[model samples]
Target chain A: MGMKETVSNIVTSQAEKGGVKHVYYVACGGSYAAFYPAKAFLEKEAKALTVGLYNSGEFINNPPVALGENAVVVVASHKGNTPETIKAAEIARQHGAPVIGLTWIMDSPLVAHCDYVETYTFGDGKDIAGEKTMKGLLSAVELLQQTEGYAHYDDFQDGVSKINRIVWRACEQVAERAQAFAQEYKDDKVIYTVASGAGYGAAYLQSICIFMEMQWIHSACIHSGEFFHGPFEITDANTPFFFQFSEGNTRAVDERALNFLKKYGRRIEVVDAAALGLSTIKTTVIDYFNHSLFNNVYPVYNRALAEARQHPLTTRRYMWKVEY
Target chain B: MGMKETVSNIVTSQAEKGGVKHVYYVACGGSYAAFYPAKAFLEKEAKALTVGLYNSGEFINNPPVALGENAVVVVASHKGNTPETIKAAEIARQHGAPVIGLTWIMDSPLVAHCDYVETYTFGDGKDIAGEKTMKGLLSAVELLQQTEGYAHYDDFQDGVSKINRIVWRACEQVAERAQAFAQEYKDDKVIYTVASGAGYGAAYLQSICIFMEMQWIHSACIHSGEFFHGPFEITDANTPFFFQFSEGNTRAVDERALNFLKKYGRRIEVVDAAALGLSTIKTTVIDYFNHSLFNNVYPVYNRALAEARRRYMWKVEY
Candidate 1:
């Protein structure tokens, strides 16, 4: 399903649950991509919301905020057995908080523990029955909308159809853009993606997965404030960097990161959503929402593009498994 | 008291306890230094001895080991108010392990817990009554020797007198060297001390403490092996580095660290141990004892060196 229809379904379902007051989304690895969107959506609709990254080992050392009786915990696990996610779900159960597990498979451990479970088996993106990645994202967006009581189910159904059409239309362009950028910056050893406000989650999740799965590059996706404190030291001439500017309190910090990188060493890549001079499919969706489409499509597009240019990910010698 | 006299006393006492088949010395901070000498002394006497460092926080994670019914558990505390040290005393007590508490001040918690307490009310290191830094080292060495039943208490007594005179002499040289090196390396952004083998511990301890107390340089001390893995990536000609070359299995590792620094950087300074050059007071002591000193004065000498440089102990600012 397209993002809009999935978002609509989440809004309506949430209204039925007396509307969420405080929403906590728990996820790790690729599933984290859903966190920012869910947080932004809930806080936009509810009174208060927070998002957290729950690692398996760290949770035991530093427990997350305890769920009060009034709390609603949203647990997202694409693969049910992620050790820490399972532990987190057990802790949530003990705290007596209401839980809604969103997953790509039915009867997973998280699904078994939640008050409600939503499964989307969007396997191959053709039928909803293959790989978990894209469909898991679709299910999470739908669940978030449902919990907010503004579930726009029909809007997302239409949105999903739009997504299907859009993916086919934009894949080639995205592939070309990603390939060209990757080849141009072939020797860069570090990759950082910075985003502000609601986009921070997307930037962070993308950076994490890329470093973990596809690249040998040292990657960090940090809040602009934090980036300036320590990581900014490495920003200088000769560094290659990318920044995602947002209209939030951290917008100024993003400006500083860019200026530092540009002044010192980095070849800065700025993707300004506001200034993008492209016509959209409709006015119902803000052009800013197109940024989301670009983020989601860019990784896949770049992978294909790199392969076409004969710079396949696996073939690069420097891309070998990190020895240390 | 000189370290030799102290070492003799500890050796004798340790031997009396059935030659101290297993000695578990528990303490922290300043107390950690005293344990160092006991560790070296006990190991030299026999290989049956085991030395363990239990930081307070770690007790909960890996519970302290229990002693056999006939075993001896030495509880060393300076202030005696350290919570985990007392808890360790309690554990030893419950297991019916014979506990000996060593402290400078009388009536401390550790003193009350142990089956026997060695209270040192002697006029501290000099005129100060409770200065445990130097006095603690002397007493711990004496206590371990006295417990071990080693003969030659007279030799240790003579050695302790020599140490007393040597400390005063060494302090001046140490102070001068520390000030000059601290000044010369003042411009570097990061300062690191490199050592191999047993000297690695001295370098590691000195680096951490000095780095903390001084100008907050991002100073690190590395075991020469660890340095070869990846730390060399940051070594440049401009980086200021220090080396501690001691003796033993560390000979090769120490030489490796020295060569590694030379290969990458030039402004490196070698703080050669007078013993390293076979000329210092320690070199004579080592020459006399040969392999035996490695098992003896090794820890005592290092502890004294670290203490003499105590004013330079460090903390992290950044």
Candidate 2:
């Protein structure tokens, strides 16, 4: 059996025997951001599951008392050697909770700590790591749903297939605009990325991973619904903002911010999933899967950013170069 | 009965009758930041209750499915008129969950929507709002603990009183250093505020409220542990960093970041809870209450920033 099928069976059986009531999606950096959409999916679709999204370091230092035999911890890292996540998996095991690990490399430190492991390889794509990890998470959520007698599991898998096809085409559709944005804002001192619902995680990932960590630019990711609060005070005509609007109940939240920014701010980029040709997936399932679609499209802009700024996305000052 | 006793009775009775499985602390901005210490306290102290800390806007837009009659929503706003929080209170009510409101006004829009309301007034201090609200939250937690037979109610209250006294003295003690820091980094274009555990929320509040909103300087609040994964790449000898260290199990997280910054970055400021006289409180309880102590000392630096920049913290321009 493939790893996906084998791990799904393992998780379902473990959850059934342990009577698991909660799941903690724990990791750091890109791996941490990958869980946000899955957390939202569980909150919206599963009636019996309570989800706790956490940073691995925070989870180890102060784990929820609710984490025990009746809990499951889903953790991932690209290299399978994040120190905090390794510790978190050990702590979760100590509490008798099953740890499900997703990594790119097999037989690594993280795999040793996991009750079940799934491995994958991203073929030289700049942004496929986030997209593939997100798929792994959705499949786990689907397994839980099927076990609980939820009927949307098949439909969700079908939607994932459809998203996988159209998502790349959608990125090609927006390539020109993405490059234009990169050229215009390559040297801007600060940028604000805003989104709502499941898409908020993508905004956070872009702000921290792309702008701050990779490009060395200052940025803040604010929720679209939260844009009117304290963070909005920083806005002016010259301020650059990126809005990622998803197709769901929370779209209004992003629309409100976009409307305000359109009138007040000049440099605004709106990456609307509905407008970007992501309609192959049904509206019912799009909100749950839109962040993964958006994740694929971000690299178009990121590549342009690398070219415009004369900095390769792979260049780093601290990561892998110095020990922290 | 006084407000505290009356509210305590109401909450205990509600929890007993409803069998609430969870509590959602919902608010926005500084009000949202105020709930972090309370959430940390409940996690360390209450074993039976699950807690969700959410921004009011996000809570209203996409609330958790667990929010039902068996859930309790605790929300706060200083002005009691925040639009998103008002909407959140309404949504919580629709879920048949009881909404506990904290505000600084006796009768406001938030009070009208709440099942229970507590009012307080913080006078002319940049830091008192967070400390006062934290005390209110601790009182509520103490009531829950007493009702659930957790038996630390008296010790907790005693520690709170001791903390209230030493907190102001800590602020006074840090006044000189605060001014010196204000003078040193008053013109810094960007700053990184870092902390972990109980102190993380304070770093977030200071980054958004004091640095960005108040002073119009760009800043990011990075969790000390998460800092190494991605944000540390932005660090250099020229980058300014503020480290807020609390007395807790998570202090090691901040210490790791601090040690790295000390060697690589020259511009760094350390706000240690122990160095600021928080030792007067018992070590066992300090982790649960250190953020409140740190909240008090921040105003000394805020005041210094205000004077040095010649831009009052309240001054605003768009």
Candidate 3:
């Protein structure tokens, strides 16, 4: 059998064996970034069958329930040597839980130790080939196939194809609009992106991180609720306020605060669901949760795909390490 | 006797009754404002008393000890019928603590209940001339004479004369400078006043309360230490920062925070001892123990005199 088929068979057989009644996906930093959607995907399709744990907290505290004897522990470590994760995997293995490892490089300790492993082949010296794009796609597709098995390969392929098509279109529209907006904001010293509820996470992860990294614009993320409490008093005629509104999430409160800002004659910009033609997704879950399978999916998957295609996800040019 | 002499005698004779081995002053809001300095003054003149139980936490929990038999309870009320304070005076009387009613109005319920009483005879008018100034001054003078008794009346008189001159000068200097400063800050959206320890109380009471009440400025008083912790992140080139500094009271931590703020290009205005030029009062018991005496003597006599003479004493208006 060819490499793809043999790997495909291994994934199918693992799911068939029902060896992973539940999967605990764990990683940190870049690994976590890649797994963010994979975990979201599992939550949707697998129902309550899977959970994600940020590795450091899992190791120190009450880690989630072991996947039992029929368990699958998927650990993603690019270096294959995050001390806590490696130790955690070892302890899980001692209890005889199956370990699955994913990485970009071969001969990694994680690949060698796990009962099942998948390694991506990044072509050597492939200049301007967009290496992260290549590896991210391969790893995500492989994780879905492994967790759902070969029986769900067609479903997995459809999701990937839809992501590529939707993301490219979204990127083209954003690029054109962003250029005009950038020109208008050329003299602005600071740009704050504000959002509420689920949108707050998106503002922090997508807007602030992307603008700061790709555009080098010093943007801050302010949760919309907090802006009105104390920061609203600081606004003046010269201060620029940016508002991001999602559907049915205190739109009235945002309007009241925005009106208050106008009272002071401050400069304000707003991007609402209607502005981006994103109002369709506003009631997606409520309308289709029972009838549609995609309704079971995490909204971040669509958001992440759009963000990745349009902007750099993070701008930390300097090396960063988080102690906890 | 004239109003001033009658009021002074009433306070001085009450001062001798010596039933006030321990005096507990009580009130809230503007009345508390007048009472705080008097409490400090009483404590200074070996009048080392407290705000009494009824006006503070004790009035909430342990009512009697906070109102001891020998304890002379001083009740101050602006509206004269502060419901909680009236109840507290009743509680004090119930516990055998003699009450001394100090108020701007004579018709208060507190007046009828107290063993001794005094009120400002001057009718309400200008912010400086009305009952506020009258009661504030009388409270200081009477509390001083009450605590000092007859032995230091001449020295007390010298202190009073000096303070009266100093107050007029200081008030004028502050008014003139504040007029200009107020116009300069007319456009400010927010103003924060920061200070440590004793200055913090004055910053909250005088700078924040007075500014909000008089100048209509949206101001808040923040502890100097807390300003560095989180508030520092909010400040930028545009914000104006004000600091109040006292020589002995402000800690090194506060000074370091001010220094740190300077690095951030914060526009800082500092008020310190050097700005308010008076020789450091010797730490002798006179300065140490005399709270009401010092307020009456220092700003009234020395600082105000310096202001009136246009001596340009060490004081920062901004």
Candidate 4:
């Protein structure tokens, strides 16, 4: 379904249950990372709702007490069948909160517990705008409009409409950079991903899901603001880093960290949102969409990394191969 | 003044201004890390008050929109002389919020900006119970009781009185391990600290201040609950990790991560809160004190680390 239809279903379902006063992004690994911008954006944009991001495993075992009838839990599993995520959907539904599932497969088990399912495809421009995180932000915008009416609702709608073009151009531009990045850092043992604000979600996904989970490389995501507080000590001439520059209020902090990295660091790959065409979106709402640009673009690099390292992104050590 | 009156004055003033609806812990470096336990304690106990934490630098420029009249801001510096922290105090005061300072120096610049100064003593066991973390937790207990009447207020009072002994004994228990950890890890390339919930504050503090800034070692703070989902792939028999086991609802979560680490990873040093004299206090108050014990105790290792590695804290430049 298109994001408008997906968001309408969410709004309609949430309206039936009073409304979404609290929203929890419940997922695992990269899916959870996908919701990072929503947490950063909504806290700044809408004051009516409280936002939370939780891993599926922790949500099932140690759910937030704030989970209740007024809350909306967003569950995303790429193929629609992660056990922990399914259980979380069940828990949220049982609490009378609405569950929206973002998935690639409609026939998956996750569809059963979801109040609404928004199918997404990252294969090409067919549904590039509906990339999981963009759809999530659209849902937030629609929900905010339903309750109190978002002031920039038109701008947001217009901005997201440009996402397909924005993302396609970015992908075209970064395809070469991705191949070069992979070839250069293929054998590197430890690579750190640095970002802050709206950019962190992509950086985190790259570190945990892309780098460590897929490539079996040691990686950590360092926040740009928190870089000087601690993480900068590890910097040297050879430490490989993927620094993401933000396109919003946090852009200054990101630049601060980048200046230091440029001074003391040698091997660094930077993905500035504005330079990557994120600024094509409305400046008033650009920050909320930077994550979408990074999420789709960085995976291009990981795909190339997987090809260069001769490692499959889908391959894993103990995932589904063993019982924890 | 004593933390008792320091807290009483806050409560008394807020009573006239319709009570504190929001509380912010604003400080830097060690001072910022010290408020970790209060955040863990207040969120679990008092649902009426909203809790937030920030570094002194961030709070100065990008202050939260919720920082208004009903908010009570706590800013701390060990010596009460950090210029940026004093600015946070002045900013919090200007917002019409009550500002409390936690520092050892009564006459420091921070005191001039804050409405109340609760002096901390980390010099010896003389004021261990009234140290910053404990004082912050005490302020939480007193505030909760004053507003909503905490069930375990008496137990908390009795618990903190014996904290000096609890902390000193914990040092005695882990002093040798601290020395050994420094000796073994002094030359390691990177070491990661892992914990969850309340225990995370100390794990983060260790990863940032102790290992990274002081020791110049590459380190990351991994959440135990999130470890399996991703961070575990970095694990091998050779990875260095300092695990902190919790004394609260998060203890089981810590155990789950530890079980996996034990199965796959080696070279792990664990500081279990239950075994570290923190459980000597009331269970109601134990989560708040776990960070305190870990905060005080981890420095021993860092001290031994700098001693063994000959990395002096004074000889550093930005």
Candidate 5:
């Protein structure tokens, strides 16, 4: 059996032992952001289980009181050497909960701490780590669904393949528009990215990872539903807004923001997954997989940003260079 | 009976019914940030309940599937008229779960939809609503503890009184320093606020509410543990960093960020609750109540910003 099957069986057996009631997706930075979609999936698709997403540092300092033999922790780090993540894995193990660690390299520090390690090779994308992490998380969630007597495991597996193709096509279609957006707004000091439902995590990643961390541009990732409360006050003709609309229950939330932005803001860009012609998959499945779809398609926009601003996505001031 | 007793009784009775396995503290923006401490408290204090903090809009858009008779939703809105919060309250009621609405007004839309209403008067503090909401949430959590055989209810009530006095004294003590820091850094366009554990929510509120919303300044509230991941790249000699260190298990996370910032950055401000002399309360109780302590003390800093920048906290340009 493969790593996925082996991990699935371990998780299923743990569940059968009858104490596991919660699953925690814990990590730091990009890896932590990567779990948002999986957390959303479990919340919507698997109501029988409780899910919590935490920053590795916070998880270690103040772990859930409910974390024990009944808990399962899924943690990941790209290089498998993040100190906080390794510590979190140790804490989870000490609590007698199974730890599933995802990493780009095997036999690293994270793997040593985890009961099961899911390893992936670097792929040809701006978000290679993100792509691999999302795939691993989806497979894990599919196993949980299978264990709970849900027949959607097959549908989910098929949907993942379809999503990969659709996202590439969507990227190609959005290239020119993404370039135009970068050319026009690259100099803007502050940008606000908004989305809702399953798409909110991607919106957050775009704002924090792409804009703030990579490009050094000031940005705020505002939920479309919460945008109207305090963030909308900053909206004006010069305010740049990037909106991600997905085919999900919270699409209306994004639509509300989009409509308001169009009226008040001159610089507005909308990335609509439904508009990319994801008609091949059922809408229900599309909604469940929209976060991954948005994550895959976002690199096109980031690439456009890199080319226009002359700042390569791979360039970092402190990530690998600093001791902290 | 008093509000605390009445509300505690309601919560205890619900737990006795043996259905509620989860507690959701739902709201938006500042209201949502207010629940961070209570959620943290429940996580440490009660092992039997699963707690979630969500934005009102997201909660309504994609509510937890576990939200049914087995769930208890505690939602709040200052004015009781927030559209998304009211809608969320309605949804919780429809699911046959009890909705506890915290608001300033009794007859507002949120109150109409909630099964139980918690109302408070406008106090003199900058975050009067936040203070009341936290107290009510602590009471509810204490009741949950009481039901589970923990004896912290009376101690928590006593701790709140001591916390109030210490927080007030700390505010006065920090006023001069906050003013000087604000005067020096008011012109700086971008600021990064960092915190961890129970104090993270206040860091979030300061960045979003005080800097972005009130001062029209660009700011990002980064979790200290997550700071090294990507955000730490933006830190340099010229970067302005605000650090909030409260009494909690995650203080090391903030300290790590602080040490890094002190080495590279010249413009740094540190607010340590331990430094503020919260000595009256036991250290164990202080860890749980640090979020509320920080929230009450933050307005002193905000007031300083308002005075220096010549922008009242209530001012709106857009």
Candidate 6:
């Protein structure tokens, strides 16, 4: 089924059946981190809907009282075999809410329990709109547009049309610097990622998934606004930082953190959507598209770091290699 | 007005202003982190209410579209002059929502913008429930009990009455170990805090404020449930981990994470609610107050961590 039709059918149907009041995004690790932008975007835009992003494990233990016929739970598992996500989807169904599970495999366990299973594309950049955050976000856009008459609907559709090309081109542009970044920081013990608003999702994934899980590095994603609050106390003149810059409403906070980092941080890498040419999209919708760009673009840097450190990105000590 | 009457009056009044559909807990640093228990509690129990916890600095620029007459924004700043909180409260006021500002001083900039400014007690732990998260939390209790007839209202009040003594006793119990913790881990470059649900906020504040801000050490608060997802890869036998154990709904998940951490974590320090005898509170509502105990109790350990590093906790600032 087409993504747009699938979203409309569900949202329209849910609206007829008391309307969608709560949208719960549930998954684990990389998949869970990927939902932040959608949650942040929807919460900011939809006054009628309450948006929540939960670790699938936590959702099963304490599902919100709001999780019922008026709710929609979106669960994602790339491999489609993540047990917690499968259980989470079941819990949503048991509570009478619709479960829309996103994954790469329709034949796997996660798909079996979902009301609607949308498979995502990987490897190629042709369907950038259908990539993880891109589809998740467009799903949000469609939800708001159909249910609440989203003002930026046309702008987002324009973005979806040009994003595939723009995102790949941005990755190509950063490929050179990314390689240099990997080589120079190969010996560093820890590298923290930073971002705010829509961009925080990608920085979080890069730190926990790309850096810690894949490269076995000591890293954490620090929120840009939260930086000045207290996290900056850990900063010395030589701290290494990676910042993800949004071009949207929360851009100024990221800029503020960047200014402080530049003054004290010895090694800093920033992925800015503005510098990546996201202005090709409408200004109103450009911020929501940042994580989409960073999602596809930063993997290039991750792979380069994996190569420079001689740590295979897929090499795992206890993930799939050991079962709990 | 008193914090209790202040909350009930606003909530009752808001029911006439089209009802409290959205409750935004707005603050920064320690204050923001302290609201997690309340937000989590309110969300799990209330069906019609939407709870939002936000850093004040970010909330000003991206204020929710839901901010209006039916919303109540609870803004907290011990000093009441945190520029962002004041601005956020102003935005909430401008949008027709009522603001309840919590601070330590009656005369502060935060008070001027708020519909109700409730002053919280700080010294002697005499009014422990009037401390940061306790007052923040009981506000949630008041909101839910008044609006939705929160089922565990009596249990929470029971916990509240006994909490001050239980909390102070826990500190007395951990007092010796707290000093040793500071002396032992003083030189470590990085130490992470772990907790889930109600306990996360305290663990989080202990990380950024106590560890990073006060002690000048690297730290991040890891969600116990999230540990297995990916962060556990950072664990080796020698990595020091501090886990805050909640005796609530999410305790099972933290217990599962702790078992694995015990295997790989060499120096793991846990502040368990059950161990701290937080059971004096009723079983149904004990989890919501774990953060209250850890909020005051952990500073004992942090004080030692501060003194051991030859760094006075409040010696310097930005």
lDDT of 2 by residue, A242-264 (tens): 77888876877778888877776
> Which candidate ranks first by TM-score, i.e. highest?
6
**TM-score of chain A for the candidates in order shown:** 0.65, 0.87, 0.53, 0.86, 0.86, 0.90
Question: Candidate 4's residue-wise lDDT over B1-318, tens digit each?
Answer: 666676677777778777776678887766677787776666556635656677676567556555767778888887777766788889888888899888877788888898887876666555677677778777777767766678878887877787777777888888888788888877776677888876577777777655443443344577787765644645442557778888866777789889988887467888887887677778765666677678777767777787877432331111
DockQ of each: 0.01, 0.36, 0.01, 0.27, 0.40, 0.48
TM-scores of the models, in the given order? 0.41, 0.88, 0.38, 0.84, 0.89, 0.93
**Which residue pairs does candidate 6 place in steric collision?**
none
Off by over 4 Å in 2: A1-18, A45-48, A124-131, A139-155, A212-217, A231-237, A311-324, B1-18, B43-47, B124-132, B139-155, B212-217, B230-237, B310-318
Please tell me what DockQ candidate 4 reaches.
Answer: 0.27
Q: What lDDT tens digits, residue by residue, belong to model 2 across residues B1-318? A: 333565466556666566666778888877777788777766555545666788787788778777887677888888888888999999999988888888877677988898877655475443433354565566456545644645566666667677666777787788889889988988765667878886567777777645542444355677788766655635442557777987767777888888887777457888998897777767666676766776667778877876887432332111
Instruction: For candidate 3, report its TM-score.
Output: 0.38
Clashes of 4: 0
Query: CA lDDT of A17 in candidate 2?
Result: 60
Highest DockQ, which number?
6
Question: What are the RMSD figures for all models against the true structure?
Answer: 20.4, 4.1, 22.1, 4.5, 3.9, 3.2
Error of 1 at B299 (Å): 29
Better of 2 and 3 by lDDT: 2
Please, what are the lDDT tens digits per residue for candidate 6 over residues B1-318? 766697677777877678788889999877888788889888788877788999887899788888999888999987777898999999999999989988987898888999988767686655777777787888888887777788888888888888888888988999898887887787776677888887788787777645453343345577888767544645332458878888878989999889987776457887788998887788788878888888788778877786887433332111
TM-score rank, highest first?
Answer: 6, 5, 2, 4, 1, 3
lDDT of 6: 0.79
- Tens-place lDDT digits, model 1, residues A84-171: 5666677766765566666766756667677666554443244312123334334444444544433344454444445445544555
Pick the lDDT winner: 6
Docking class of 4: acceptable
